[PDB]
Write a protein that binds this DNA or RNA. Sequence first.
DNA 1: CTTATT
DNA 2: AATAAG
Length: 246
Amino acid sequence: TWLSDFPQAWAETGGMGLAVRQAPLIIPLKATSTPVSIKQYPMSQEARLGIKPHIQRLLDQGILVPCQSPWNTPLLPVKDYRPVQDLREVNKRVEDIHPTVPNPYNLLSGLPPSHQWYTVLDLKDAFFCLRLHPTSQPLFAFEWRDPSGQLTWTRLPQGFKNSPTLFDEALHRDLADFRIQHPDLILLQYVDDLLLAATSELDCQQGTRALLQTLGNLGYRASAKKAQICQKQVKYLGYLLKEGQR
DNA sequence: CTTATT
DNA sequence: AATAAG
């Protein structure tokens, strides 16, 4: 099965990803920025117990680490509890980058009628596959208490304004060669949502095998549960792709 | 929780 | 002078 043939490619069997070819990211600040330390609003025990096992898993995975930082932003006290960091004051102090992710409408314009066999993959915990340079880690620090200090991220965090664009650009670099090796396949990338299109069932099977092999080797992980493999009809970016339509 | 947006 | 999102 698709599961068995590519253990490394799937999130369910390959472990947490890590994009091994990508240098740890340095996050430039605006020219006038200085650190902001925002106090953590008190969190109820209910919310703290809800959040706690997620924090512990991330610590175990090395995605969070202890730190002491002059930066601090709050975790939401009401966040099915999973921690959500309010990074708006950090985002304001980080230098802007050009938004290079295409909007879905334009992206799908590059899908020709000749290619009507589809594979759709979504990468699991995509931002977390990208390492942050140690110099940039303190930027994203927050407080954590167990009724005691700060933690921060060692990977590109949720809620950071440039994460989608930086991920999209990193994956484009990592999939550049795949595109060159498979000139007859169509590959659409929208941050962590991928569409592979081919002219035949067999070509789509072979391409999908090569894409999974490649993604796994690079350190990314796709959702086996959500995967739509070699169908003439798929759901991609809120559209139903069918009979060359939409 | 905070904060931007008829 | 509810709303959606970090």
